[PDB]
Write an enzyme that holds these catalytic residues in place. Structure first.
Site, PDB file in Angstrom:
ATOM      1  N   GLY A 144       0.811  -1.206   0.000  1.00 39.71           N
ATOM      2  CA  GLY A 144       0.000   0.000   0.000  1.00 39.71           C
ATOM      3  C   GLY A 144       0.846   1.258   0.000  1.00 39.71           C
ATOM      4  CD  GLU A 183       1.486  -8.244  -2.741  1.00 40.62           C
ATOM      5  OE1 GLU A 183       1.696  -8.611  -1.567  1.00 40.62           O
ATOM      6  OE2 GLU A 183       2.305  -8.416  -3.663  1.00 40.62           O
ATOM      7  CD  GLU A 254      26.204   7.101 -21.096  1.00 43.12           C
ATOM      8  OE1 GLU A 254      26.640   8.190 -20.663  1.00 43.12           O
ATOM      9  OE2 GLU A 254      26.946   6.155 -21.433  1.00 43.12           O
TER      10      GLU A 254
END
Ligand code: GTP
Ligand code: ACP
Ligand code: GDP
Ligand code: Y5L
Ligand code: CA
Ligand code: MG
Ligand code: MG
Ligand code: MG
Lengths: 437, 54, 327, 427
Positions: A144, A183, A254
């Site tokens: 969370g 999740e 880069e």
């Protein structure tokens, strides 16, 4: 010299930060109290390691890092840990109650309480920089706090630091070690809100690190300590060019230029070899060709996928140890003939190689053995979209029944942000398939 | 195999090998949606306290 | 018990593999979208290979090889043979083939104009000469040299094609079913006109003179071997089957690095259907490879039992009809 | 992260007193509040259930509520009665007479403000209050009627805290009065609305376990409460002890409750043991896993094969191979995957604690949000209607101001709960 600030959010971010900074200090010869005997420029300097460390008049080398968790017990172990003297108290920020695996609770409810305090402590480190180039954000997709508060932080960092690059080290969710069932929700929600604010993101599937520890380290039930020490090795390989002398990936810009031709498709796949157990009595040391060949085995990747059924857009090889350019080209010549390495037609088929002569460092008593040479390959392959397909499929299964959605709506979120975030993911999968077919 | 841009130093060396050529919302909008969600929280809590009042 | 799911109800082969697996008493079938399976008898289009091998505590196996469509599409097969050095442009057992879009046209008509000097009948996938007609028919298709002198069975003066069923297990062992079939044409081969293609197209559905010489226009290896003995003084093994085993081995060994699941997180096997064409001088030509082939009714019971023994029970053991092609 | 414990009524105080006896022993606290343990794992999270008083004493953050002094006097006279803060004893004199109306509307209304004062005093001392857990029965009057009146008033004063309950369901097999289905249906209506997590502890299941399994011919309330205190200790393990999962009440509710009204869990325990009789063979990890999922170890008289598991939480306690636990837990899911909803991926999470309960070397506790819990609510709705279709015994309630319509609304809401659990059993 240009400084980089590291930000660690949630449990996964903080504990992985502990792993990396422990490894950084061993590589640069910095001690738990912050002293660096090899540093002869006391109180300042602009060497390459000063990218990640500042210097005090007493000779202390302070990480340019800030730790933030909406709950204190993880950072409290840092405040009293082996490297307690390393950090200043102001760069360790904790709340009282966590986000309870709820993206909307971490982003909206509790996040709004602490977002201004964190940015101020972040501003304190940026004012110590003569030329900030950007940030490195460590967090988890599933938490969370790691998902909710990170996306709120990534939004504000594009406002207060619009000219700076931002890189992510993300922990893709794996049920073998995950403690939350929602999740997939938090992962899609945080990827959608963060996508346009991150220039380059390195995903790390906990499933891949778990099986690597079981297969190559002989660990029956790997812990977060096992996983995070292996993750820090990969992260150290990726950031080594910012901390050491060299000519490849010397600034955060880069990284995007070499690895990310398309802004949205900014998820390079990382492969690492060799992973050798410290308990292995007799070990035959692997050659340059053997460890370069291992970079194209899926069993050594941070995300399990099949690069043979995608297309590369870029490819870096970062070596550490006894490696010379002659042996690398000989290895690449052999590998190109035996493996399916297809690049997109608008890209040259080739590799950018960076070699660091110092062999990989391992913590004493750790699970990893010392090796003569190692390599981390960063490849931007469209095969990593397999991880998005898995993640979006789990999202589609739960959301079709609106399971657990009430927890997010009850925090102030709107049910539309679910489908809005899922639509962006459906576009991301679409972009990968265009480039990869 | 063309080996280009070979740079060397004490720490190591770097180069490139080619095998074949080719063929944000403002702070205003952020504070606005953060407060639109707090409004939706305050409304849901008020409807609860109104329900518990009955 | 082991668990499996069925995601292709149209599969006649794996419909029998479902029954055999269930009748074992050690295999339980789940619902299509159940992720906790050991085996997937997946769909033919858009099989989600990216979701296989991510269930903890489950060795997962699928009845398809990801990337094998490069050998089972007529356009992809031609590109694979022309470009891979293991097969080379001068592949002796594949007919000349060019890919044209509604392309290699310039390189095609280069050879069709060298045919003017001479046999110039071609097929596109239909059959025509000169070829200027065929291009407008196409307006992706592949044009290929039509074999004008095929081996003709007697009595009947008939055309045919040979179908061989090949099983590739999870270890990439290449198994050839000892039983093949000749899908014959019941019409006499007439090389005067190709517009009438009942004697040229040896497809079973195209035949619907059908059923005259043997049941269902299917001559198996027992009878066809006896014919070669009596008529041509040779055997099926020497005159045809050696070339068939060489073609099957060359094609699969070429794509092994790109489809092999030796070190993958999931495993693959697949049944293939190789279709061969024997010409006038007992030379075998590869026509195409089939990724989802159907069997013959006589051989379903024996072949599907072998698929369970060799490809399924080898990974999930319980409580030979194949010729292994070595490599 | 402190938790405030409340125990209301006869049943609530008897299982509550046993719960405090069991977990005080697990944490090494003696009846006088002095800690005399050996491991530092005990005291690391001791503040979740205990306040630290003068002289390094540990006072349970517990509030004892009853409309009678009878049961609460037995608690203060009990083995651990001296550990409870004397101010936290709040009691009347009249009693509730097994009447939900007396506890909720008349007799309990007089006393509820006094309880909320003690609740408020404990909450102000809390560094960060997770929420509340209530022990009570649904068949009586105090724990049932006044218990739900407290929960309603606690939610009004702490609307952003977790409400957890251990709710004992009545059964004619262990019946005090005939009006128990009335009190239970009125209480379940309240629990559906004002709690985040409710552990359905069916007295019918506790009796069947005592009779069929433990081979006890005449089970007492003491034999039933042994199973309750063992289950209560198991489910709260990840709240009281440090481990890989240091859990709180909110994360439990977030991951166990996919839809707000479906928050009634089936508890389960293994190995099933009877009082005063110790068995000497430890269970293998395959046996703990086999029994904890068995219906004969469920504390709610429901057949889990008649429904599907929305979410599952499992606790293993003792010295054992975590790898063998993972293999066995994955073995149950892959062997009976039709009983786990496919639209909630990986809905079984397992935790392991090294400290085993008293008298056992290895134990396993099961928390199940199964759609088969409708059988419990169907059973009560049948006993309710059998009397309500004739308005029998209703005068005990209408004499306290209640109208027949409130009974009709409560019957309707529970029937909606049953049909809602039926919605996701077919999907
Ligand atoms: N690799 C790795 N993964 C971790 C670690 N800690 C947690 N995770 C993963 O992170 C996910 C849960 O996110 P957490 O970081 O624990 O949660 P959080 O960011 O603190 O957010 P909240 O606790 O919900 O407020 C799970 O999928 C875990 O597998 C760690 O130390 N290393
Ligand atoms: N180059 C060629 N020379 C001679 N005959 C050919 C030929 N190509 C195809 N044929 C004939 O045409 C028939 C059908 O060709 P083709 O195999 O490409 O179609 P198809 O895909 O429908 C059969 P299947 O898919 O079942 O293998 C073959 O069986 C063969 O008899
Ligand atoms: N398991 C268990 N159930 C009890 C106990 N005491 C009472 N009950 C049950 O609770 C109901 C009676 O409620 P009770 O708590 O005694 O009345 P209250 O004082 O008004 O709350 C009946 O259904 C009993 O079966 C006990 O100690 N254990
Ligand atoms: C269905 O998936 C779940 C189920 C439960 C939980 C979680 C996920 N995750 C948590 O953090 C809380 N939790 C738990 N809580 C508590 Cl007290 N004991 C336990 C768990 C897990 C097992 C023991
Ligand atoms: Ca210096
Ligand atoms: Mg956390
Ligand atoms: Mg075909
Ligand atoms: Mg009583």
């Amino acid at each position: 010299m240009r400084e980089c600030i590291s930000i660690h959010v949630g449990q996964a971010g903080v504990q992985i930060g502990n792993a990396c900074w422990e490894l950084y200090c061993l590589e640069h010869g910095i001690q738990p109290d912050g002293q660096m005997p090899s540093d002869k420029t006391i109180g300042g300097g602009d060497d390459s390691f000063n990218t990640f460390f500042s210097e005090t008049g007493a000779g202390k080398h302070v990480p340019r890092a800030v730790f933030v968790d909406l709950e204190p017990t993880v950072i409290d172990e840092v405040r009293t840990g082996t490297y307690r003297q390393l950090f200043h108290p102001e760069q360790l920020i904790t709340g009282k109650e966590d986000a309870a695996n709820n993206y909307a609770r971490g982003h909206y409810t509790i996040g709004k309480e602490i977002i201004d305090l964190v940015l101020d402590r972040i501003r304190k480190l940026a004012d110590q920089c003569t030329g900030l180039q950007g940030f490195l954000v460590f967090h988890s997709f599933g938490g969370g706090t790691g998902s909710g508060f990170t996306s709120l932080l990534m939004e504000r960092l594009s406002v207060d630091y619009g000219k700076k690059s931002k890189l992510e080290f993300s922990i893709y969710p794996a049920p073998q070690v995950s403690t939350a069932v929602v999740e997939p929700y938090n992962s899609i929600l945080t990827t959608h809100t963060t996508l346009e604010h991150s220039d380059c993101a390195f995903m790390v599937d906990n499933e891949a690190i778990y099986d690597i520890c079981r297969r190559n380290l002989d660990i029956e039930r790997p812990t977060y300590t096992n996983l995070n020490r292996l993750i820090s090795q990969i992260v150290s390989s990726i950031t080594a060019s910012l901390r050491f002398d060299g000519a490849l990936n010397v600034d955060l810009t880069e990284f995007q230029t070499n690895l990310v031709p398309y802004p949205r498709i900014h998820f390079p796949l990382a492969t690492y070899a060799p992973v050798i157990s410290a308990e292995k009595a007799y070990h035959e040391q692997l050659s340059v060709a053997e460890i370069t060949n291992a970079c194209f085995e899926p069993a050594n990747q941070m995300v399990k996928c099949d690069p043979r059924h995608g297309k590369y857009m870029a490819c870096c090889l970062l070596y550490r140890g006894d490696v010379v350019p002659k042996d690398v080209n000989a290895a690449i010549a052999t590998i190109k003939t035996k493996r399916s390495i297809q690049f997109v037609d608008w890209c040259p088929t080739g590799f950018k190689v960076g070699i660091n002569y110092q062999p990989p460092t391992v913590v004493p008593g750790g699970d990893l053995a010392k090796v003569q040479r190692a390599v981390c390959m960063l490849s931007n392959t469209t095969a990593i979209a397999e991880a998005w397909a898995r993640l979006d499929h789990k999202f589609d299964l739960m959301y079709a029944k609106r399971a657990f959605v009430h927890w997010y709506v009850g925090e102030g979120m709107e049910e539309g942000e679910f489908s809005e975030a899922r639509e962006d993911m459906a576009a991301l999968e679409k972009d990968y398939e265009e480039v990869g077919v | 195999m063309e080996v280009i841009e070979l740079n060397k130093c004490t720490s190591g060396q770097s180069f490139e090998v080619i095998l074949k050529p080719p063929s944000d919302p403002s702070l205003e909008e952020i504070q606005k949606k953060l407060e639109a969600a707090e409004e939706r929280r305050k409304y849901q809590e008020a409807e609860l306290l109104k329900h518990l009042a009955e | 018990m082991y668990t499996f799911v069925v995601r292709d109800e149209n599969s006649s082969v794996y419909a029998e593999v479902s029954r055999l697996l269930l009748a074992t008493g050690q295999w339980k079938r789940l619902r299509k979208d159940n992720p906790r399976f050991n085996l997937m008898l997946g769909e033919r289009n858009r099989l989600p290979f990216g979701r296989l091998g991510h269930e903890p505590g489950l060795v997962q196996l699928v009845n398809y090889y990801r990337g094998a469509d490069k050998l089972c599409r007529k356009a992809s097969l031609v590109k694979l043979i022309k470009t891979s050095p293991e097969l080379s442009e001068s592949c002796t057992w594949f007919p000349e083939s060019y890919v044209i879009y509604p392309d290699e046209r310039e390189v095609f008509l280069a050879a069709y104009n060298r045919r003017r000097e001479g046999g110039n009948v071609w097929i596109a996938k239909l059959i025509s000469s000169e070829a200027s007609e065929l291009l407008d028919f196409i307006d992706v298709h592949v044009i290929q040299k039509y074999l004008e002198k095929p081996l003709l069975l007697e009595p009947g003066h008939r055309k045919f094609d040979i179908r061989s069923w090949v099983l590739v297990d999870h270890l990439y062992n290449i198994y050839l079913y000892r039983e093949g079939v000749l899908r014959t044409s019941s019409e006499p081969y007439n090389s005067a006109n190709f517009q009438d293609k009942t004697c040229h197209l040896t497809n079973h559905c195209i035949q619907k003179n059908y059923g005259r010489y043997e049941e269902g226009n299917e001559m198996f290896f027992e009878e066809f071997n006896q014919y070669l003995m009596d008529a041509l003084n040779t055997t099926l093994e020497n005159s045809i089957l050696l070339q068939i085993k060489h073609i099957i081995r060359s094609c699969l060994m070429c794509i092994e690095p790109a489809i092999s699941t030796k070190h993958l997180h999931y495993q693959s096997f697949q049944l293939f259907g190789f279709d061969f064409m024997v010409d006038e001088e007992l030379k075998v030509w590869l026509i195409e490879v089939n990724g989802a082939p159907a069997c013959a009714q006589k051989l379903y019971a024996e072949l599907c039992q072998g698929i369970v023994d060799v490809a399924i029970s080898s990974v999930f053991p319980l409580a030979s009809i194949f010729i292994k092609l070595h490599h | 992260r402190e938790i405030v414990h409340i125990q209301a009524g006869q049943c609530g105080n008897q299982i509550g007193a046993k719960f405090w006896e069991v977990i005080s022993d697990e944490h090494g606290i003696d009846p006088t509040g002095s800690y005399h343990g050996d491991s530092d794992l005990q005291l690391e999270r001791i503040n979740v259930y205990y306040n630290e008083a003068t002289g390094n004493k540990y006072v349970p953050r517990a509030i004892l509520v009853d409309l009678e002094p009878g049961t609460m006097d037995s608690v203060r006279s009990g083995p651990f009665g001296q550990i409870f803060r004397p101010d936290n004893f709040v009691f009347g004199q009249s009693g509730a007479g097994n009447n939900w109306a007396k506890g909720h509307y008349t007799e309990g209304a007089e006393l509820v403000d006094s309880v909320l004062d003690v609740v408020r005093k404990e909450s102000e001392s809390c560094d960060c209050l997770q929420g509340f857990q209530l022990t009570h029965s649904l068949g009586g009057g105090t724990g049932s009627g006044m218990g739900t009146l407290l929960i309603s008033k606690i939610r009004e004063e702490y609307p952003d805290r977790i409400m957890n309950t251990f709710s004992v369901m009545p059964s004619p097999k262990v019946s005090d009065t005939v009006v128990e289905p009335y009190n239970a249906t009125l209480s379940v209506h309240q629990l559906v609305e004002n709690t985040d997590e409710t552990y359905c502890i069916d007295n019918e299941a506790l009796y069947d376990i005592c009779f069929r399994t433990l081979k006890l011919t005449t089970p007492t309330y003491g034999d039933l409460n042994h199973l309750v205190s063992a289950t209560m200790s198991g489910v709260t393990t990840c709240l009281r002890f440090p481990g890989q999962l240091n859990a709180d009440l909110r994360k439990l509710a977030v991951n166990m409750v996919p839809f707000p009204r479906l928050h009634f869990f089936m508890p389960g325990f293994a190995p099933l043991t009877s009082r005063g009789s110790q068995q000497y063979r430890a269970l293998t990890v395959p046996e703990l896993t086999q029994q904890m999922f068995d219906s004969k170890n469920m504390m709610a008289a429901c057949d889990p094969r008649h429904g599907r598991y929305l979410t599952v939480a499992a606790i293993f306690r003792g010295r054992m191979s975590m790898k063998e636990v993972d293999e066995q837990m994955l073995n149950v899911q892959n062997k009976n995957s039709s009983y786990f909803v496919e639209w909630i991926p990986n809905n079984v999470k397992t935790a392991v604690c090294d400290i085993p309960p008293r008298g056992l070397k290895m134990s396993a506790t099961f928390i199940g949000n199964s759609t088969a819990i409708q059988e419990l609510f169907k059973r009560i709705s049948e006993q309710f209607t059998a009397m309500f279709r004739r308005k029998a015994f209703l005068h005990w309630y209408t004499g306290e101001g209640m109208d027949e319509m409130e009974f009709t609304e409560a019957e309707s809401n529970m029937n909606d709960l049953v049909s809602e659990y039926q919605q996701y059993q077919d999907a």
